Symmetry: C2
Subunit: 143 residues, 2 copies
C-alpha cells in the first residue's frame, strides 16, 4: 500500500476534493492522498486506473452529492466496495457534501454500503478551518 487515502468526487465539491483535502490532510497534516487527476498517467484505461489506486490506498474517501450518485462517478464507489469485501485493511468513509436523494437502482452492495458506512457531514464555511469538526473526523479515520 502506497496511499493513506484515495479521494473520489463527482465552496464546490471539486474545490473540497482538489484544493482543500491536499491543503489540510497533505500540506498540513502530512498524510499521503491519491487523486485521479494528479497521481495517474493520462490516457490509459480508467477502470484499471481506479482499481489500481484503490489497491494501493489505505482509506477511501467519497464526497457524496446528487451529481455523484446520479452520474458516472458512482463507478468509483462500486469498485471500492467490491475491493473492500475482499480486503478490510481498506476502510471507506463517505462525506455528505449536501443533500442527495439516493437513486433507485444502484447495485445491491452499493446501496448496502450507503446504509452502514461512516459519514462526515460537510457543513460549508464552518468546516473549512483546519481545526474544524469535519477535519477532526477526517483525521480520526485516517490510518
Amino acid at each position: 500500500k502506497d496511499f493513506d487515502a484515495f479521494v473520489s468526487y463527482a465552496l464546490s465539491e471539486e474545490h473540497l476534493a482538489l484544493s482543500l483535502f491536499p491543503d489540510v490532510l497533505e500540506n498540513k497534516y502530512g498524510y499521503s492522498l491519491c487523486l485521479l487527476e494528479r497521481d495517474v498517467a493520462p490516457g490509459g484505461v480508467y477502470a484499471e486506473d481506479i482499481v489500481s489506486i484503490i489497491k494501493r490506498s489505505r482509506r477511501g474517501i467519497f464526497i457524496l452529492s446528487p451529481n455523484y450518485v446520479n452520474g458516472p462517478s458512482i463507478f468509483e464507489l462500486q469498485a471500492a466496495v467490491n475491493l473492500a469485501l475482499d480486503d478490510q485493511t481498506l476502510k471507506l468513509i463517505l462525506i455528505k457534501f449536501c443533500y442527495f436523494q439516493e437513486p433507485e437502482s444502484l447495485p445491491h452492495l452499493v446501496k448496502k454500503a450507503l446504509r452502514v458506512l461512516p459519514t462526515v457531514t460537510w457543513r460549508g464555511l464552518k468546516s473549512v478551518p483546519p481545526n474544524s469538526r469535519f477535519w477532526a473526523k477526517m483525521r480520526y479515520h485516517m490510518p
Copy 2:
C-alpha cells in the same frame, strides 16, 4: 480470442442486449457473444471483468442511450476505446437505441469515438426481425 462480440448496455435496452442479440446473432447466425451477466462468474471486481472480457473479444457492441452515457456504464466504452487503440484485432460499433445528447463531460477518447465509430440505428419493431436492416448491418460488422 474466444468471443466474437461483447454486448455492453446500461422494447427495452435490456431486452435488446439480453434477449434479442442472443436470439439473432448467437442463435440465428451462430456467433459467440459475451454478456456480463451470463459469461463471467459472480463476485470479483466489476472493473477487472470488463477489462478481461474486452481483451477476449473480437468486437465491442455498445447500446447507447442517455442512461448509458450519463451513468457509470460509460466506462465500459472508455476501456474498449483505449484497449482498441493498443490492439487492432478489436473493432468497435455503436448502437443508437434512442436519441441522446453527447454529455458535456465524457473522457476525451470517448467523445472522439462517438464522433467516428460506425453507428447502427435501432428502429423499434422494424429492426427486430432477423432480416431487418439493423441485423444486416450487425452481421456485416461481425468477424
